[PDB]
Design an enzyme around this catalytic site. Structure first.
Site, PDB file in Angstrom:
ATOM      1  N   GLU A 132       0.719  -1.269   0.000  1.00  0.00           N
ATOM      2  CA  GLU A 132       0.000   0.000   0.000  1.00  0.00           C
ATOM      3  C   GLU A 132       0.753   1.329   0.000  1.00  0.00           C
ATOM      4  OE1 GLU A 132      -2.911  -0.326   3.175  1.00  0.00           O
ATOM      5  OE2 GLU A 132      -3.972  -1.939   2.126  1.00  0.00           O
ATOM      6  N   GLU A 239      -5.886  -8.179  -0.610  1.00  0.00           N
ATOM      7  CA  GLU A 239      -6.482  -8.037   0.713  1.00  0.00           C
ATOM      8  C   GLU A 239      -7.946  -7.677   0.560  1.00  0.00           C
ATOM      9  OE1 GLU A 239      -4.748  -5.289   3.495  1.00  0.00           O
ATOM     10  OE2 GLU A 239      -2.685  -5.869   3.035  1.00  0.00           O
TER      11      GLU A 239
END
Length: 304
Positions: A132, A239
């Site tokens: 991320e 995710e």
């Protein structure tokens, strides 16, 4: 069965981020091969393993790895690949090293050559450039991903897939207007998979067990699906999670069913998360008492 890959994140080695180097067994812990085996018997064939860059390569990312931390990373990866499942090595760093943005692609490439050299001959290992990226220059994000690819391939690790991540916490719902430039990444092995993350709560942070609606998953990945198809790319949801309640369960089923009808672009999904130190975590997929393991896994079986 339905997808190329379907599995879970195995969290633990990245815990206690504020404690560096930290102490194993107190600040952080590695995944349990025994419970991983249970998930494999259920049909999962991919496991993402987060770890901290600072614990693997202390002080300078161009330095030597810490033998002890590296030993456990290797042990965890082999436990997974010896069973025939894929292991995703994930420097869970948000594009930052010692909380400072990684601004040197050359240093990042060196870090990646170092890591890739440890798994160069293992075809079941997948490299994740970084977890991320966020609040940083878009061109830098592109350059960091390319530097990782260059480093990995320079090490002779040419058979492995590489999961690249974008800006804006690599979220699927914000992919198209933020990460369009990521289509320019190149890989001589042509094995780039675009990894996106997608949570179903209000702000997409994945901190609440409540989901916006029974259709929020599908809604949030529709634009990304079209982007992948239009550009001839492949992606994976690295995710995703939802609480153990009706609305979220319906949203999860709807999202996965939608992805199942678009396997020309979606290679699969990875749940967040399993691991030995989650306890009563709302998204725990850890056998045998994790709430997601007991209530969510049953609805995921049709995809395994």
């Amino acid at each position: 069965k339905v997808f190329q890959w379907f599995g879970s994140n195995e969290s633990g080695a990245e815990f206690g981020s504020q404690n560096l180097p930290g102490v194993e067994g107190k600040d952080y812990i590695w995944p349990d091969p025994n419970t991983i085996d249970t998930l494999i018997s259920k049909g999962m064939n991919i496991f993402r393993v987060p770890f901290m860059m600072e614990r693997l390569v202390p002080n300078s990312m161009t330095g030597s790895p810490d033998p002890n931390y590296l030993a456990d990373l290797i042990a965890t990866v082999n436990a997974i690949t010896q069973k025939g499942a894929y292991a995703v090595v994930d420097p869970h760093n948000y594009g930052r090293y010692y909380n400072s943005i990684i601004s040197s692609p050359s240093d990042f490439q060196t870090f990646w050559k170092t890591v890739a050299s440890q798994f160069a001959s293992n075809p079941l290992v997948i490299f994740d450039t970084n977890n991320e990226y966020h609040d940083m220059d878009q061109t830098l994000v592109l350059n960091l991903n390319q530097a990782a690819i260059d480093g990995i391939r320079s090490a002779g690790a040419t058979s492995q897939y590489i999961f690249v991540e974008g800006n804006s916490w690599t979220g699927a719902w914000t992919w198209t207007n933020v990460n369009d430039n990521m289509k320019s990444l190149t890989d001589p092995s042509d094995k780039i998979i675009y990894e996106m993350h997608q949570y179903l709560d209000s702000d997409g942070s994945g901190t609440s067990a409540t989901c916006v609606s029974s259709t929020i998953g599908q809604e949030r990945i529709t634009s990304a699906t079209q982007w992948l198809r239009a550009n001839g790319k492949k992606g994976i949801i690295g995710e995703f999670a939802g609480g153990a309640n009706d609305v979220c369960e319906t949203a999860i089923t709807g999202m996965l069913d939608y992805m199942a009808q678009n396997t020309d672009v979606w290679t699969g999904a990875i749940w967040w998360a399993a691991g030995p130190w989650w306890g009563d975590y709302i998204f725990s997929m850890e056998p045998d008492n994790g709430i997601a393991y007991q209530q969510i896994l049953p609805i995921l079986t049709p995809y395994l």
